[PDB]
């Protein structure tokens, strides 16, 4: 068995190996990359996502989210308070202001210490989940707006044609902006490209151990657990590395820098934070190996998780027994 300790693997494809996206994912899996839940892909030196980032300031962040924490430093939830619209140029200036900027630090480890010590005492503003793309249309390799769609994969594997579309999303971050512990919708893959700016630190639980994290979360968030049998689908709960180690939960960590891709694998729980002003692009995708994870994915039916149009068909075809209850949650 490849990668039996479930370590995060880092790949360096050549320009030739970067042509065929599906083939490279299957290669990484042949080496055991999925066992970690997360992999890093450093693009060939010849590749670029676009020519420059000099002209992005007029993108609108229609609903910036202020991430307000409750709890203790290592075990907290966050809620998202909606703020007034602002442009990417306005948001960058805010991120760089004395109130929001990255503090002085020695290295990524010192900054990670500072994040876990102090996150809860601040409410950073995240420009998350913005439909759109920063890949040039002429970038032919690993262009996250040109991937094979999940609807087409389901059709190819299972023969059923379904409605829905699959498009990328932009994330504009600042110091302390936070992504809570989650797996993807329908336990899909994700791919995330850090276009510019400061790094993003990731934490991940191997898929084979995901239920250990779920059991800890039910203990640590006991009211939320009684409210919903899949409350991590709400994407609000944070648990620090120190608390994970104290409770024996297997996990790994890695920092993504500008110009690098990360891939999350089906049922790989992940969480993390931004180091400073940055912009990432991410999209969900599927492969043949995903289908069985899709069939077994938990679902929120309490009403909180509320998701995209395209998840309807995935539930309806892969999980027909759950469909009626799940749809009641959506309506
Ligand atoms: O970058 C973020 O805020 C969150 N991204 C992801 O969870 C992802 O790419 O799967
Ligand atoms: Mg612009
Ligand atoms: Ni994710
Ligand atoms: Zn729920």
Curated annotation (Swiss-Prot):
Binds 1 Fe(2+) ion per subunit. The modification PolyADP-ribosyl glutamic acid is found at residues 16-17. It catalyses: N(6),N(6),N(6)-trimethyl-L-lysyl(9)-[histone H3] + 2 2-oxoglutarate + 2 O2 = N(6)-methyl-L-lysyl(9)-[histone H3] + 2 formaldehyde + 2 succinate + 2 CO2. It is found in: Nucleus. Keywords: ADP-ribosylation, Chromatin regulator, Dioxygenase, Iron, Metal-binding, Nucleus, Oxidoreductase, Transcription, Transcription regulation, Ubl conjugation, Zinc. Ubiquitinated via 'Lys-63'-linked ubiquitin chains. Deubiquitinated by USP14 with the help of TRIM14 leading to stabilization. One of its GO terms (biological process) is double-strand break repair via homologous recombination. Residues 136-302 form the JmjC domain. 2-oxoglutarate binds at residues 126, 192, 200, 235. Its EC number is 1.14.11.66. It comes from the Eukaryota. Disulfide bonds: none annotated. Its cofactor is Fe(2+). Its main location: nucleus. It is an enzyme of class 1 (oxidoreductase). Residues 8-50 form the JmjN domain. Histone demethylase that specifically demethylates 'Lys-9' of histone H3, thereby playing a central role in histone code. Does not demethylate histone H3 'Lys-4', H3 'Lys-27', H3 'Lys-36' nor H4 'Lys-20'. Demethylates both di- and trimethylated H3 'Lys-9' residue, while it has no activity on monomethylated residues. Demethylation of Lys residue generates formaldehyde and succinate. Belongs to the JHDM3 histone demethylase family. This is Lysine-specific demethylase 4D. It comes from Homo sapiens. The lineage of its organism: Eukaryota, Metazoa, Chordata, Craniata, Vertebrata. The chain holds residues 11 to 341 of 523 of the full protein.
